Design a protein around this ligand. Structure first.
Ligand SMILES: N[C@@H](Cc1ccccc1)C(=O)O
Length: 483
C-alpha cells in the first residue's frame, strides 16, 4: 500500500480492534505527516491579526422556529472530573439546586422542543469513560433521551494507538493494555460524525445546523440571533470568540492567513484568506512576546461552534471521507504515571481548527458569559451561590445585582482543589456571594449556615489541623476573618 512499516502496524492493530475505517484513514494521514517530520510551527510571519469582527451584542434578529427544527445541539462529554479528583463524567457534577450540567442542557433542550421546535435534536459525544454513567442518569432522569440514547443521542469518541517516539510503531504496555490507546482530541468529532454514519443521517433527515460546545460550559446556549446571522451571511462555519485579557495571554488566539492553492485537475489556481487558531505549542519561541500581546491578537476560541452540516459532509467527502486538521503531537509516556515507560506521541486535533477548512468561515465576538467553563471548585462555588439564578428557559445567568460581573473566587488549592475538600467547606451551606466582589480562602475553613459575603473578603487560617469554622449567620464585609 506504500505505507511505512510502522504505519502498517498501526493499521493492523486498529483493524484487529475493529476501529472503524474512517478513524483509521484519518489517523494514518496524521501518521504520515509525523513521519515527514512535520513541525506544526506557525511563525508570526505566516499569519496576520484579526482586528474587526461582528459582535453578538450588536445583533438583534432572531431566526424563526423552522431553523431550530433543523438544528442539532451537540455537547462534548468525554471529560472526567479529573481536575476535581473526580473519576467520572464531569457533566454529572451538581451545579445548582441538585441539578448538573446535564440537567440544565436537557431542560433547555426540552424547553425549546415544547415551545419552539419538537424536532430539535440533542447529541452527546461520549468516551468509554463517560458512556455508562451518562446512560444511567438519563435513564433515571430523562427517559425520552434514554429511549433513543444509542440510536440518536450518543456519539462515541474514537480511540487511536499511541506510537513510540523513536520508531512511530504502536506502543506496547503489557502492564495495562488500555494505556496503549488514547482519545484523539475534540477534533475527532468530525471523524466520529462521518465514520459512524451519523453525519449523513442528519443531513438526510434535513438537519442543517449543529451547535457544538463543552458540556461543562453552561454559558453555551442556543442563541437564535446566531442562527439568523448564519442564514443571512450564508456562513458555513461560525466560531464564537471572546476578547482576550491578561489571564488569557497563555491561551490560543484567532488569526488570519493568506493561502494560495494549486488547482487539482481542471481547477484554476486560487488565492484566498482563511481564519485559523494558533496555540502556544505551535508558536515559535521568538514570537512568544507577540503571542501574548492581547492587543495584537485579541480573540480566543470559546469552542462554541456553529456548523452547516451539508457543507461539512461535502467537504469531508471531497477529502476522502476525512477532515485534515493540523495534528498536535502530545509527548508523554505510555503510562503517564511512570516516567520510565516508553516515550510516545499521542496524535490529536482541535475541533476549532476546522475553521480553516471552510470558504464561508467566520468568527463573532460574544460576551464572556457565553464562556463560563467550570474548571475548578472555585468556579463551582460561584455557580452554586445566589450570584447565579435559573431563568424560565432553564439558563444560568448572573443575578442582576452582579451587574454582569461574577464574584471572583480564589480557593486554597491545598484543601479545595479536590471535590473531597470542597464539599466539606460548604458542608453546612453555600455562602451568599451575590454581593461579593472577591472571596479568598486560605487554609482549612468551613462555612456556616446563613453566611453572607459582601465586598472583598479574605478568610485565612494558619494552623493546618485547626478546622476554622465560620459562625452561622455571620456577615463579612471587606474584611479578613481569621480565628
Ligand atoms: N462583554 C463580556 C465581557 C467580555 C467580553 C468579551 C471577552 C471577554 C470579556 C461580559 O460582560 O460578559
Amino acid at each position: 500500500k506504500s505505507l511505512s512499516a510502522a504505519a502498517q502496524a498501526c493499521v493492523k492493530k486498529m483493524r484487529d480492534a475493529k476501529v472503524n475505517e474512517a478513524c483509521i484513514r484519518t489517523f494514518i494521514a496524521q501518521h504520515v505527516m509525523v513521519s515527514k517530520g512535520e513541525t506544526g510551527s506557525i511563525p508570526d510571519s505566516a499569519i496576520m491579526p484579526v482586528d474587526s469582527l461582528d459582535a453578538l451584542d450588536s445583533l438583534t434578529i432572531e431566526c424563526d422556529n423552522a431553523v431550530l427544527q433543523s438544528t442539532v445541539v451537540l455537547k462534548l462529554n468525554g471529560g472526567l472530573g479529573t481536575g476535581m479528583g473526580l473519576c467520572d463524567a464531569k457533566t454529572l457534577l451538581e451545579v445548582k439546586d441538585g441539578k448538573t450540567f446535564l440537567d440544565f442542557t436537557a431542560l433547555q433542550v426540552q424547553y425549546l422542543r415544547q415551545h419552539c421546535s419538537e424536532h430539535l435534536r440533542f447529541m452527546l459525544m461520549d468516551s468509554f469513560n463517560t458512556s455508562a454513567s451518562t446512560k444511567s442518569f438519563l435513564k433515571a432522569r430523562y427517559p425520552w433521551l434514554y429511549q433513543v440514547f444509542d440510536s440518536e443521542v450518543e456519539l462515541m469518541q474514537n480511540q487511536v494507538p499511541k506510537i513510540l517516539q523513536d520508531t512511530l510503531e504502536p506502543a506496547a504496555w503489557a502492564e495495562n493494555p488500555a494505556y496503549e490507546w488514547a482519545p484523539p482530541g475534540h477534533g475527532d468529532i468530525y471523524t466520529a460524525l462521518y465514520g459512524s454514519g451519523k453525519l449523513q443521517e442528519l443531513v438526510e433527515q434535513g438537519y442543517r445546523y449543529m451547535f457544538v460546545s463543552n458540556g461543562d460550559n453552561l454559558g453555551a446556549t442556543i442563541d437564535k440571533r446566531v442562527l439568523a446571522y448564519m442564514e443571512k451571511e450564508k456562513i458555513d462555519f461560525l466560531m464564537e470568540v471572546c476578547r482576550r485579557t491578561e489571564s488569557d495571554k497563555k491561551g490560543g488566539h484567532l488569526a488570519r492567513q493568506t493561502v494560495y492553492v494549486k488547482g487539482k485537475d481542471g481547477q484554476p489556481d486560487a488565492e484566498k484568506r482563511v481564519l485559523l487558531l494558533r496555540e502556544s505549542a505551535q508558536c515559535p519561541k521568538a514570537d512568544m512576546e507577540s503571542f501574548q500581546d492581547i492587543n495584537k491578537y485579541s480573540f480566543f476560541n470559546t469552542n462554541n461552534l456553529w456548523i452547516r452540516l451539508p457543507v461539512l459532509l461535502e467537504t469531508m467527502q471531497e477529502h476522502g471521507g476525512t477532515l485534515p486538521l493540523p495534528v498536535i503531537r502530545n509527548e508523554k509516556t505510555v503510562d503517564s504515571s511512570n516516567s520510565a515507560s516508553p516515550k510516545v506521541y499521542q496524535l490529536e486535533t482541535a475541533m476549532g481548527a476546522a475553521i480553516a477548512m471552510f470558504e464561508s468561515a467566520s468568527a463573532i465576538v460574544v460576551p464572556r458569559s457565553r464562556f463560563a467553563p467550570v474548571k475548578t471548585c472555585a468556579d463551582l462555588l460561584a455557580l452554586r451561590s445566589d450570584a447565579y439564578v435559573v431563568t424560565d428557559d432553564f439558563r444560568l445567568v448572573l443575578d442582576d445585582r452582579c451587574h454582569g460581573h461574577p464574584p471572583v473566587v480564589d480557593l486554597d488549592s491545598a484543601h479545595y482543589k479536590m471535590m473531597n475538600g470542597f464539599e466539606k467547606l460548604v458542608q453546612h451551606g453555600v455562602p451568599s456571594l451575590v454581593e461579593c466582589k472577591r472571596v479568598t480562602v486560605k487554609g482549612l475553613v468551613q462555612f456556616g449556615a446563613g453566611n453572607v459575603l459582601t465586598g472583598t473578603v479574605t478568610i485565612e487560617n494558619t494552623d493546618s489541623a485547626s478546622a476554622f469554622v465560620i459562625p452561622d449567620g455571620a456577615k463579612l464585609n471587606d474584611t479578613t476573618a481569621s480565628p
